[PDB]
């Protein structure tokens, strides 16, 4: 029931890649674990301001605290898999 926020810039290629990759992971190797909320910083920059986001894409585990962050298009799958295990 923990919450992930993915901060993307629209349909730019790093963000398209990151979202495809992450949906694949969360439907397979992490099937039950996280809730995913996607935040488009091109549409809602004010939310990037609130959450203090600089890099795009940014994956953040936001609930339960503490908040922990990974940046990048997640094309390094094993680093992402390892990172999500540790936040779970």
């Amino acid at each position: 029931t923990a919450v992930l926020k993915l901060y993307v810039a629209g349909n730019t290629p790093n963000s398209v890649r990151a979202l495809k990759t992450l949906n694949n992971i969360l439907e397979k190797e992490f099937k039950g674990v996280y809730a995913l909320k996607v935040i488009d910083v091109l549409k809602n920059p004010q939310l990037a301001e609130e959450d203090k986001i600089l890099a795009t894409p940014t994956l953040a585990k936001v609930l339960p605290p503490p908040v922990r962050r990974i940046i990048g298009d997640l094309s390094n799958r094993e680093k992402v898999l390892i990172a999500l295990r540790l936040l779970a």
Partner: protein, 217 residues
């Protein structure tokens, strides 16, 4: 080439009118030379004298230190934040560091700055410091490209910008220096280049008292 007055004592005189409007000026200098003071005073003077809102983008200092440090100069930045005329945009590093898992850029940062400019109707921006951004990321290539993209966007929005430096390429560059002379401090400012326009050449002395006070020109 139109210029925006700084009202920093002496500066509009040695720069012949102030800073080139709608462009980035680089303020370069080692630690302790007054770069942050120049950046803050540009926005403060902007708001209090011309009613031009400012955005201070900080990549290193906490906004709480920027506020508390401006006090000794008689500048109440919290009042101008409460009034909606100044916004400090906190892009300082997160204490847990940056964990990389693929390619990225700094789109969110550039969209935040753009949003802030529109929300606050800002026409002056200070960024402090370009150097700190590079230190934040083991990806100099990403940062260098994003600073250009940012400068490009700021200029298309029409704002006038100071970027401080201790990388970036500019045709507007101001150098701050602080030399130890025996046991006294000799501070100088030099306008190195100003975008195909006219300015006084060489180092001029300044002092810090209620701002930067340039003299002997």
């Amino acid at each position: 080439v139109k210029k925006i007055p700084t009202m920093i004592e002496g500066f509009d005189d040695i720069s012949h009118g102030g800073l080139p409007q709608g462009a980035t000026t680089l303020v370069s200098g080692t630690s302790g030379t007054g770069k942050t003071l120049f950046a803050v005073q540009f926005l403060y003077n902007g708001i209090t004298i011309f009613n031009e809102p400012g955005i201070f983008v900080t990549f290193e200092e906490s906004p709480q230190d920027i506020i508390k440090n401006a006090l000794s100069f008689g500048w109440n930045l919290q009042s101008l934040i409460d009034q909606g005329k100044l916004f400090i945009l906190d892009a300082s590093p997160d204490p847990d560091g940056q964990e990389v898992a693929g390619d990225f850029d700094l789109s969110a940062l550039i969209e935040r700055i753009q949003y802030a400019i529109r929300k606050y109707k800002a026409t002056r921006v200070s960024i402090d410091s370009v150097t700190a951004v590079f230190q934040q990321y083991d990806a100099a290539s990403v940062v260098r490209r994003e600073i250009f993209r940012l400068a490009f966007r700021l200029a298309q929005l029409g704002v006038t910008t100071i970027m401080t430096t201790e990388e970036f390429v500019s045709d507007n560059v101001v150098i701050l220096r602080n030399v130890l002379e025996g046991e006294r401090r000799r501070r100088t400012v030099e306008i190195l280049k100003l975008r195909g326009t006219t300015h006084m050449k060489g180092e001029y002395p300044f002092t810090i008292n209620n701002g930067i006070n340039i003299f002997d020109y």
